[PDB]
Amino acid sequence: AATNILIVEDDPMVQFIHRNYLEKIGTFDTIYSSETIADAKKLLASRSIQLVLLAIRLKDGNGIDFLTDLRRTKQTVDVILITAANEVNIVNDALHLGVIDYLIKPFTLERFEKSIQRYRTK
Amino acid sequence: AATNILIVEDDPMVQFIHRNYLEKIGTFDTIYSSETIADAKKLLASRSIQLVLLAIRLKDGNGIDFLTDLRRTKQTVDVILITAANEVNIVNDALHLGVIDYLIKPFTLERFEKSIQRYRTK
């Protein structure tokens, strides 16, 4: 390969885990670390990077918003998300849309009324 | 007791299931049906609706896009997403963000390289 990878992740242990794993395949030369979006933006403008490993919860901002920006400016960067956030998190915490509950299909009857009683509590 | 619901789902079977399940609790007077965003919007301007059971893959557009407009217009409405779409679908199909992969934390030793292999083939 011989390609550049930027890791953007808040927790330094998981940063080390991506670092370790990428060298355990080890096709790639330079591996950059960043704990903030502000660092990541400046690193992209500094050294040319091929792929990016991005989280959603960073210290300074939201990962999904940064990716939105990254596509608007039409960056020569291939992004792959490594994140704890599920569907419910993307809608509420990342898109700020304010959904009561995210029902996954297929669903059981008990899960449906669980999602209905969540409305009543609001 | 006594509240309004609009179902917006493109397939009429799952529409009947939502209807059947809402009555199998039954806190509600009227339950409205819709197969498009267009039919839903017109109902929202028309009759009083408290909560909305919204899908993502609708006939005339994307449910997440309809939700975004619904909040930018600031509608007095309680969305509850009932959908088969995962995180990857919200990022790429619903937000068009051209992501290579989505690893849900925590990830396996091996699933990391599969996610990298999806970069190697692009």
Numbering used by the authors:
A (entry chain B), B (entry chain A): 0 to 121
Would you copy out the relevant sentences from the publication that reported this structure?
MaeK and MaeR exert their function by activating the expression of L-malate catabolic genes (maeP and maeE) and the expression of their own genes upon the presence of L-malate in the medium. Structural and phylogenetic analyses show that L. casei MaeKR proteins belong to the citrate family of TCS, as well as the characterized DcuSR and CitAB TCS. We also solved the crystal structure of the REC domain of MaeR in its activated state as well as the structure of a mutant version defective in the phosphoacceptor Asp.
In an attempt to determine the MaeR unphosphorylated monomeric conformation, we performed crystallization studies of a MaeRREC mutant form where D54 was replaced by an alanine (MaeRREC-D54A). MaeRREC-D54A crystallized in the same space group and similar size dimension than the wild-type MaeRREC. The crystals were obtained at high concentrations of sulfate (1.6 M) and it is well known that sulphates can mimic phosphate ions. No interactions with the conserved Asp9 were observed due to the absence of a magnesium ion in the active site. The residues Thr82 and Tyr101 forming the Y-T switch present the inward conformation as in the MaeRREC-BeF structure, confirming an activated state for MaeRREC-D54A. The fact that the non-phosphorylatable mutant also adopts a dimeric swapped conformation indicates that this conformation is not induced upon phosphorylation. This notion is further supported by the coordination of a sulphate ion in the absence of a phosphorylatable Asp in the MaeRREC-D54A crystals. EMSA assays showed that the D54A mutant had completely lost the capacity to bind the mae promoter.
